[PDB]
Ligand binder design. Structure first.
Ligand SMILES: Nc1nc2c(ncn2[C@H]2C[C@H](O)[C@@H](COP(=O)(O)OP(=O)(O)OP(=O)(O)O)O2)c(=O)[nH]1
Ligand SMILES: [Ca+2]
Ligand SMILES: [Ca+2]
Length: 438
DNA sequence: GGGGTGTGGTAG
DNA sequence: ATCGCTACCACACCCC
């Protein structure tokens, strides 16, 4: 047990937090890409015609947690029992569930208690612990197999378990669905062998958005090949509105309001006008959805292909702690803020940069919300407050940065016992070069 | 046209 | 119990 005023709190929280791990894995994969290509010019040009293979482990955490389960879960069966990965027993997030569990309507992000109600009597839920080290080891095998296949010109890391892989097609060569199926099957086979039991599904297309949709269509443990030329009503009819990239719950809600609760992309496709779309959700998002409903990427999504080194280049740096926050006085809040700054500055020095603008964000208990929320140590219902500040000269000096952070906290006026959440941000980063004469 | 701020939303 | 992170685009609204 490590409380928020204990010096070891940040380390222990991060060691336990799957969301932290997802972010740290993603950032390290982006840096590793940038290094390996420091002199290689890996880029797609307008000269190229390319095919996109979008590859993703199926139920990653669940699968790996199963394969590596301790002897205490030896008899559990991935194909027959509903399996989730989670820390706890009641209001604990389900980080991953297998497709058996999904067959009863369980979804990632659900609390265990709710997912327990969704099972008939006699069927028991299996709760496996996280295995973060082996999650990373299986990913290494994933990216190592991808590279040694030598069939891709650009291998883009999306996350620990997910990658967008790009093959350039010579006009000299006739690409066929026979070759593409074979590549998919090779990819799937090799990865199942290299990871010793994990499965990936693959979306294969000539746009990124179609490759993502194809991938959803491909799951579980399969592959799908859908080019712009194969688009059809049967295709669009098989997708929910929030299968579109960029469409989360808030955009979904707005689209359902504007267009009479479409229940598939085909419904939305046949009912929408671009103007009303822009009006409903926003001009740029409206245009991206419009382009996507034709199977076409917008210019914003396309940048990762034509200039991947600037897309994967870290532009800001931050930490967020919105769990376990229970401070009794301002002194303890200030020490926590310093611990956070120290951690962030360690990271900033690794990447040899300075910051010119910083931000403090906090969560504050809503005035009518219980002091102890339903989730043990959760933030509960909160109001958000942020404030930023430009620094005079770019710096990496703890003294300057931590002082401004604690001052930023001061101006937001949040009583320490009402604090439920804190984020610390370095918003603008500035390279440090060999020349540092004033 | 250029800048500024805080807030919202998405995604693994 | 239980580990509700974090990067970055877009937008509303302000200044010149
Ligand atoms: N989407 C989502 N995934 C999470 C979250 N926390 C942990 N994860 C885990 C689930 C996966 O094991 C891993 C990658 O996310 P995915 O989108 O691929 O979901 P998952 O692999 O569990 O199932 P699927 O790919 O649809 O077969 O991250 C979360 O809050 N949201
Ligand atoms: Ca996955
Ligand atoms: Ca996702």
């Amino acid at each position: 047990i490590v409380a928020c005023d204990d010096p070891d709190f940040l380390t222990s929280y991060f060691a336990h937090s799957r969301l932290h791990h997802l972010s740290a894995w993603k950032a390290n994969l982006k840096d590793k890409f940038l290094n390996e290509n420091i002199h290689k010019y890996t880029k797609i040009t307008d000269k190229d015609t390319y095919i996109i293979f979008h590859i993703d482990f199926d139920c990653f955490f669940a699968t790996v947690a199963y394969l590596c389960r301790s002897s205490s879960f030896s008899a559990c069966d991935f194909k027959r029992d509903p399996i989730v990965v989670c820390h706890g027993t009641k209001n604990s997030d389900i980080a991953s569930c297998n497709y058996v569990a999904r067959s009863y309507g369980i979804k990632n992000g659900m609390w265990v208690s709710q997912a327990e109600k969704m099972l008939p009597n006699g069927i028991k839920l299996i709760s496996l612990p996280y295995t973060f080290e082996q999650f990373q080891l299986k990913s290494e095998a994933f990216y190592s197999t991808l590279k040694r296949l030598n069939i891709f010109n650009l291998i883009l890391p999306i996350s620990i378990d997910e990658a967008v892989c790009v093959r350039i097609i010579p006009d000299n060569i006739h690409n066929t669905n026979t070759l593409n199926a074979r590549l998919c099957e090779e990819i799937r086979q090799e990865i199942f062998q290299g990871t010793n039991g994990c499965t990936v599904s693959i979306g294969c297309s000539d746009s990124l958005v179609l490759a993502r949709l194809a991938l959803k269509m491909a799951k579980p443990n399969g592959y799908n090949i859908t080019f712009k030329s194969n688009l059809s009503e049967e295709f669009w009819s098989s997708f929910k509105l929030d299968d579109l990239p960029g469409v989360g719950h808030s955009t979904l809600s707005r689209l359902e309001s504007t267009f009479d609760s479409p229940h598939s992309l085909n419904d939305l496709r046949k009912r929408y006008t671009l103007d009303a779309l822009k009006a409903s959700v926003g001009s740029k998002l409206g245009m991206k959805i419009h382009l996507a409903l034709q199977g076409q990427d917008d210019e914003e999504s396309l940048k990762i292909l034509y200039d991947p080194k600037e897309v994967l280049q870290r532009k800001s740096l931050s930490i967020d702690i919105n769990w376990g926050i229970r401070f009794k006085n301002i002194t303890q809040v200030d020490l926590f803020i310093e611990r956070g700054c120290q951690y962030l500055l360690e990271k900033l020095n690794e990447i040899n940069k300075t910051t010119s603008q910083i931000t403090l964000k906090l969560m504050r208990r809503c005035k009518d919300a219980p002091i102890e929320p339903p989730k043990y140590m959760g933030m509960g219902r909160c109001d958000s407050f942020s404030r930023s500040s430009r620094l005079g000269i770019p710096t990496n000096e703890f003294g300057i940065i931590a002082t401004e952070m604690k001052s930023l906290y001061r101006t937001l006026g949040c009583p320490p016992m009402e604090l439920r959440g804190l984020a610390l941000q370095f918003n603008k980063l500035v390279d440090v070069g060999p020349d540092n004469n004033q």
